[PDB]
Design a protein around this ligand. Structure first.
Ligand SMILES: Nc1ncnc2c1ncn2[C@@H]1O[C@H](COP(=O)(O)OP(=O)(O)O)[C@@H](O)[C@H]1O
Ligand SMILES: Nc1ncnc2c1ncn2[C@@H]1O[C@H](COP(=O)(O)OP(=O)(O)O)[C@@H](O)[C@H]1O
Ligand SMILES: Nc1ncnc2c1ncn2[C@@H]1O[C@H](COP(=O)(O)OP(=O)(O)O)[C@@H](O)[C@H]1O
Ligand SMILES: Nc1ncnc2c1ncn2[C@@H]1O[C@H](COP(=O)(O)OP(=O)(O)O)[C@@H](O)[C@H]1O
Ligand SMILES: Nc1ncnc2c1ncn2[C@@H]1O[C@H](COP(=O)(O)OP(=O)(O)O)[C@@H](O)[C@H]1O
Ligand SMILES: Nc1ncnc2c1ncn2[C@@H]1O[C@H](COP(=O)(O)OP(=O)(O)O)[C@@H](O)[C@H]1O
Ligand SMILES: [Ca+2]
Ligand SMILES: [Ca+2]
Ligand SMILES: [Ca+2]
Ligand SMILES: [Ca+2]
Ligand SMILES: [Ca+2]
Ligand SMILES: [Ca+2]
Lengths: 269, 269, 269, 270, 275, 269
C-alpha cells in the first residue's frame, strides 16, 4: 500500500509554495509549452482528501489522475518538429541557485532530480526496480501485463501529463516515485537520430525533467529503454550520466554500472 | 469451419458491454491520440447475437463481417507523422490494476492480451496459425488468395477499425480470434527506422494493442511480419517479447521459439 | 489481333455483377480512395459494341480508354505521404470468401490475381512476356519505343486509372492481360525505403492489386522492375512471392525462378 | 556554324502542327501532371520560318532563341509538394506510339525518334564528343559555364525547361538534329529520396517520358545527362538509362566507352 | 563567488549604449533573419547598475537573472519552416568590424573580442576546466543538470536563448568575463539535415554570427559546446569550429588537448599558457 | 586603398548597357527570383559620386551597400525547398553568345565569370587570397574577426543581395572583386545531399553565379568552403571545375591545383 505519514501532510504547504514560486515550461522539437502548476496542487489536495477517507493507506488504483481530476492536462496552433528554432525560441528548465534537498533513495544523500534505470530488453530493469529499489509509488506506463500491475503501489497512467502530475505531486510530498516505462514518449520522439542511434533532444528532455524534479524536491527513478544497437548502449549510458542526477545500468539481471550526484559528491560505482 | 455461438458467449454479452463502458480508450501512433468509439463494438456484438439467434448459432464468417452487419464501420472519432510530441501529447492504453482473465488458447493459463506470430516470409506462420493454433475466428487482412479464404471461420476485413471491432467484439465474448495479417498497418507505418530496421512506435503499438485486449478479456493471435533483414529477425523477436503477452517464432515450417505470460508465470519454450 | 469469342460476350453480365456486388477502394501512403466501378462497366460496353461493329477482331489502338471514354478517371483536398496513419485510416482490398476462378494462363490452374514478372534491367522481362507468356492484351505504360508498340495487341495508356480500367475490364471477360510496365507507379512511390532498398507499401500495393483481380476473376501479369541493388533482387523476389498469386524471375534473357498459386496448390519452380 | 532551313523543313511545318494538335500531352515529376501548351510550339515554328524567309534560309542560333521570338515562353499550363500522395495527384506517363517511329540518320543510322543520353563523369569528354563527333544542327546551351561552344552560330542560349522543350520539339519535329548541353539545371534540382545508384527513381521515368514526347513528335534529340553519382556507380546508372532511352552514349577519358541505339535494324549494343 | 562592479564597469555603460545603438543587428538560422532589440540589453544594463548601487558594488548571480530584472525577456522581434527556399528568406550574417577589435586578458592574453568555444566529449572535463582553470566573472548556467557550480554566487540560471544573449552582450560589453555552461539547449534543438561530421552546417555559421556579435560589442565570452558527434569525428568538428570562433579549446581526459586564440600577437595554436 | 581610375569611369555607361540589355533571375530549390538591375546601377552611381568627393581613393567601409543605399534588396508567397520542380519551373542564367571579356586576374587572359578558391579548413585559402591573389576589393562575409577586416579594401556585408551588388556593381567597372566567404549561403543550403556529401544545386548555383559575372564582364574570386569529408574534397573540386571559369585548390598553406578558362584555352596546373 501507499501510506501517507504526517511528514507528507506537513509538506503539502511547502509543495504549493515551490509550485507557485517558479513558473515552468517544457520544450522538445516544437515551441515551449507552460506547465499548469494548479493541476498538480489540485491533485495533491485530492490525494490528501482520499487519504483522509482511508486510514492514511491508499491504493495506487484510487490515486490515478483520470479518477481524481476532471481534466488531466498539465500543458497549456500546431507546430512541426522541423520549423525555425528562432521562430519558436529555445527553453530549458532553469537550475536551482540554492542547495538541492537530499534524499535516501535511490542512493544515500542523492540530490533531488531524476535517475535513469537503463539496460537492454530483459536485462532486469523492472526486477532491479521492484526488488532492489522498492519504490513507494510505481507508475506503470506503456508496459505489457506483468506481476507489477497487481501491486497496490502501481498507478496506471496513459498520458505524459499524468506522469508529471504523479511524479511532481507525490514526489514533492516526499514519496519515492518510479516510472516503468518512459517508452511511450521515447518511441514517439520524432526527429533525425544523432550519434548513438537516438535523437539528441532525448538528452535535453532528461536534463529538463531532472531539473523539474530538482526544483520541486522530487526523487524519481525512470526506466529509460532506448531502441539502440546492443553495443551502442555503453555510449548512450555515458551520455545519460551527463544529463541526469542518477544513472543505473542493468546487464544479465544484475546492476552493471551506477552514477549518483550526492551531498558527498558525484559517485561512480 | 463454422463459427458456433454457445450459451457461454451469450452470458458474456452483458459483461462485455460493462467492460467497454467502464474504461474510455484511445490509440496513438505518430500523430495525435484518437478515441475509440466503444458503442460500435457493442452494436457489432448485438448484430452477431441477433444473427446467431436467426440461424442455429452456426454462423458463417462471411455473414459476420462488420461491413455487412454495420451501416458504418468507423471506430476512431489532419496531423503529420513529424509534428511536436508536446503539441499532440502522448497516449498509451492504461494497464489493468486487477489480475487479467486467463485463457486456454494460444497457451494454457495465458493472460488476456495479444500474441505475435513472427517469422520470415514462407517460414510457416499461416500454416502454424491454421493447423497448430486452430482459431475460432480467422480475420483475413492484406493477404493474397489462399486456401484459408474458403474457410467458414474466415472474415474478410479492409480497415484497422474493422480488425479491432471483430477482435474486441468477438474476443470479449470468449472467442479465439486470430489476424492474418497486420501487414497493411505495419507496411504503412511512416517514420524513421530505429535499431533493427524498424520504426520504434511499432513496439509501442503492440503493447497498446495487447493492453486493449487485456482490458477487454480478449485472447488474440496476430501474425506480425514486418520488413526486416533475415539476420535481424532474432533481435526484433526478442524486443517483441517485451511488448506482448505471447510471442511465437516460425522457421522452416515449424515453431522455433515461444514465450507466454501465464498464471503459472512467464514461460520461455 | 484481339479477338472477342462468345465466351467473352457471356461474361459481360457476370462482370457488371462482380463490379456492382463489392465496392472497392485503393490506398498508398495517403488516404483510401474509392474506385468508380461504373467507368469499368462503360469501358466493357464500348469494347463489346466495337467488337460487334468489326468482325470480333479488334485493334489494341482502337480499345484505348482515352479514345472510347469521355473521361478516364477511376478514382473519386491533398494529403502528404507523411501523414498520421490514424488520421487517414488503413485500407486493404478484401479477400474472396468463395473459391477464386482458375485460369490456364500464365500457368495451368492458376487462381485469379496478379503475377509479377521480375528481373534487373535487361534480364529479359519484356522478351519473356511477349515470346514465352504470349498475352492477349498488352498494356504499354512507362516504356521507351520498342517492337512491342507496333503489335495489334498493344494498348497505350498514360494513367494508373487507364491501367486498372483495361486490366479489370478486359481481364474479367476472360482476356489474358499484361502490363509492360508499372515503372511510372513504382518510380513515383514516395516514402522511406524499408529492408531491401524499397518502400514497404510496395508489397501492400501488390497484394491489394492481386486481390482486386482475384475479386473480378482477372489473370494479369505485371512486369515489376523497381530500383533495387543487383544482389538485393533475390530478397525482394522472396517478399513479392508472399504478396502475389504468381511470381516470375528473369535473368540472362531467361526464367530464373517461378511461383504460382494453383488449384493443385502452391508450385515453386 | 549556321542553321540552314531546307525545303524538307518547310514541308514538315504542316505535319508538325498536325502531330501537335492530334495528341494532347502532359508531364509529371513528383507532383501533379501538368499539360503542355502545344500552341506555343506552333507559334515558335511560325516565327522561325518567318525569320528564315527574311534571311536566306541561313539562321543564327542567337536569333532563334524563344525569349527573343515569343512574348511568353511558358509551355506548362495551387503549388504541390514532392512528398504528396501518388493517389491524390495520379500518375501520368506520356503515351507510346502505336505506329512505327520516324527514323533518323543522327545520332546513329536508322535510329527511331526519341531521346539519346550522352553520359559520363565530369571531364570525360561529353561536350567534346557532342560538338566534334556528333556535329548537331542546333546546340541548346543550358546550365553550362562559358565555353568555346557558346560562340558558335548553332548555339541557342536558354534559361528555362519550357524553352528547352520548345526548341527541342519545335525544331526537332521539322527534322533538325537538336542537342542539349546540358540538362543539369533540372537534374540538380530533382527533389526526392535517392534510390539505388545514388539517384532519384523519377529520373528514369522522366527520361522515358521525354523520349516518348520526342518519339510522338518525330524528334531526334541528344541530351548530355550528368547527374551527381559516385565514380564506380556510373556503370549501373548507364545500364538503367539504356532501358529508359532510345539512344545511350557513355564517355570515358575523352573517348566513347559504350553505345546503345534502338534502330530499324534493331537494338545495337556497341 | 560574488560578482563585483568596478568603476571600470560604470565608465563602460555609455560606451556600451552607443555600441548597441550604432549598429542594427539580426540573427538567422534555417528560417528568416530576425532583428535583435538592442533596447532590452540597455534596459538590462541599467537594472544591473541600479541593483549594484543598492548593494555595495558586489552582486549575486541569482539577483541579476533577466527574468527577475526585466518584465519581458524577449530580444528577437508569421512562422517559417527550417525547409523553406533560401532565396525567399535571403541570407543574413552579422557584419564584421572595420576597426581593430578591443583586446582582453581572458580567456587568453591579448585575445580579440568575440566567442571562445570550449569543446569536448561528455565527461572530458569541460565544466571542470571552465570553473577551475578559466575562473569566469559571470557563469551562465543553461540546460545542465544539478552540479556544484549551481550553488556559486557567480551562477546566473537562464531558460531562453534571448536571456543568454542579454547577459552575454549586456555584462560582456561592460568588461565582465562571461561564460555559458551549457549551450546544449540550442545545439540539441538544431533542426536540419546533418552535414559532414554528423552535425548541421548552420551550427558553424551560428558560432561565427555569435562571435562577430561579441566582437562588435567588445565582449569576451566562453561557451561550452558539447556536440552529439562520434568519438572519431570530434577532431574534424574542432578543426571546423576553430575556423568559426576567435577562441577554441578542446578537452580530453580532464585536460586541455588543443587551443586556438586570435590575439593582438597573432593566431596562436596550442600555446604554453596555463588558463 | 580602393582607387577609381579613368578606366573605371569610362566603364559606367557600358555597365548600365549590360545590366539593362539582359533581364536576369536566380533559382535554388524554390521558384526563380528576378534580380533588380536598377539597385546595382544606383550602387555604381553612389560609388562614383563618393569617389568624386574623395581623391579617387575610397575606403571599403564607405562603399558598403547598407551605408550608400536606403534599401539593399536585389531580389524582387513563400515556397518550400521540397516543392514539385514542374510547379516552380527551372531557371539557369543564360550564357553569352559573344566572346567573354578577358581579364589579367586571377589568371592571364581568363574569361569573365567566377573562380572558386577551395580547400580544407586552415588549408590557407584566406592567406592565398590576400597574399598571392591581391584583390582590389575584399568582401568580408560570414567570417570571424581576422587581420583582413582592418584592411581598407575590406567591405563588410550581411546579406546575399549585398554580395551580388558589390560583385556585379564593382566587378563590371573592372575591379578585381573577391569574397571571403560564401559560407553563410553554403551552410544554409537546404536539401538532400547528393554524391560527395553535398547538395547537387550547389554546382548549379556556382554555374549561375559564374554566368551572371560572364554576362556583366566581372572577374570574381569566391572562397568556397562547404562541409565535406577530408577525402571527398578531391571529387568535389573536380565537379566544381566543370561549374566555374576558375578553380584553385589549397593544401598546407600552398596552392595544390589550378584550372582557368582563358583566351589561350582551358589550363590545368
Ligand atoms: N529472452 C529471455 N530468455 C530467458 N530469460 C529471459 C529473457 N528475457 C528476459 N529473461 C528473464 O527476465 C529477467 C529480466 O526481467 P525484467 O526485469 O522484466 O527485464 P526488463 O525490465 O529489463 O525488460 C532476466 O534476468 C531473465 O531471468
Ligand atoms: N521459396 C520457397 N520455396 C519452397 N517452399 C516454400 C517457399 N516459401 C514457402 N514455402 C513453403 O510454404 C510453407 C510456408 O507457408 P506459409 O504458412 O504461407 O508461410 P508464411 O505465412 O510465413 O508466409 C513452407 O513451410 C514451405 O513448405
Ligand atoms: N546491357 C546489355 N548489353 C547487351 N545486351 C543487352 C543488354 N541489356 C539487354 N540486352 C539484350 O536485350 C535482351 C533483354 O531484353 P528486354 O526483355 O527488353 O529487357 P528488360 O528486362 O529490361 O525488359 C537480352 O537478352 C539481350 O539480348
Ligand atoms: N581534371 C582534368 N585534368 C586534365 N584534363 C582534364 C580534366 N578535366 C577535363 N580535362 C580535359 O577536358 C576534356 C573533356 O572536356 P569536356 O568535353 O568539356 O568534358 P565534360 O563535358 O564531360 O565535362 C578531357 O578529354 C581532358 O582533355
Ligand atoms: N564515465 C566516467 N567514469 C569516471 N569518471 C568520470 C566519468 N565521466 C566523467 N568523469 C569524471 O568527471 C570529470 C569531468 O567532469 P566535467 O567537467 O563535469 O565534464 P564535462 O563538462 O565535459 O561533461 C572527468 O575528468 C572525470 O574525473
Ligand atoms: N590546426 C592548425 N594547426 C596549426 N596551424 C594551423 C592550423 N589551422 C590553420 N593553421 C595555420 O593557418 C594557415 C591557414 O590560414 P587561413 O588562410 O586563414 O586558412 P583558411 O582560410 O583555409 O581557413 C595555415 O597555413 C597554418 O599556418
Ligand atoms: Ca520491463
Ligand atoms: Ca501468410
Ligand atoms: Ca523492356
Ligand atoms: Ca560539358
Ligand atoms: Ca558539465
Ligand atoms: Ca579563411
Amino acid at each position: 500500500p501507499i501510506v501517507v505519514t504526517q511528514a507528507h501532510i506537513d509538506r503539502v504547504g511547502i509543495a504549493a509554495d515551490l509550485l507557485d514560486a517558479s513558473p515552468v515550461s517544457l520544450q522538445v522539437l516544437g515551441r515551449p509549452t507552460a506547465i499548469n502548476t494548479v493541476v498538480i496542487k489540485t491533485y495533491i489536495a485530492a490525494v490528501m482528501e482520499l487519504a483522509s477517507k482511508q486510514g492514511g493507506s491508499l491504493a495506487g488504483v484510487d490515486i490515478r489522475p483520470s479518477v481524481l481530476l476532471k481534466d488531466t492536462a498539465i500543458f497549456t496552433a500546431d507546430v512541426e518538429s522541423d520549423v525555425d528554432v528562432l521562430d519558436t525560441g529555445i527553453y530549458s528548465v532553469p537550475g536551482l541557485a540554492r542547495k538541492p534537498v537530499t534524499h535516501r533513495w535511490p542512493s544515500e544523500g542523492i540530490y533531488s532530480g531524476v535517475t535513469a534505470l537503463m539496460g537492454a530488453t530483459g536485462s532486469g530493469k523492472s526486477i532491479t526496480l521492484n526488488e532492489k529499489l522498492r519504490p513507494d509509488v510505481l507508475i506503470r506506463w506503456g508496459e505489457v501485463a506483468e506481476a507489477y500491475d497487481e501491486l497496490d503501489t502501481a498507478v496506471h497512467i496513459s498520458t505524459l501529463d499524468e506522469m508529471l502530475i504523479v511524479c511532481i505531486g507525490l514526489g514533492a510530498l516526499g514519496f519515492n516515485v518510479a516510472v516503468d516505462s518512459v517508452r511511450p514518449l521515447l518511441f514517439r520522439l520524432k526527429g533525425a537520430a544523432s550519434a548513438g542511434g537516438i535523437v539528441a533532444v532525448f538528452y535535453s528532455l532528461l536534463t529538463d525533467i531532472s531539473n523539474l524534479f530538482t526544483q520541486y524536491d522530487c526523487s524519481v527513478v525512470m526506466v529509460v529503454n532506448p531502441m539502440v544497437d546492443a553495443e551502442k548502449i555503453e555510449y548512450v549510458f555515458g551520455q545519460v550520466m551527463a544529463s541526469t542526477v542518477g544513472a543505473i545500468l542493468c546487464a544479465d539481471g544484475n546492476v552493471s554500472r551506477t552514477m549518483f550526484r550526492t551531498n558527498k559528491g558525484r559517485i561512480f560505482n
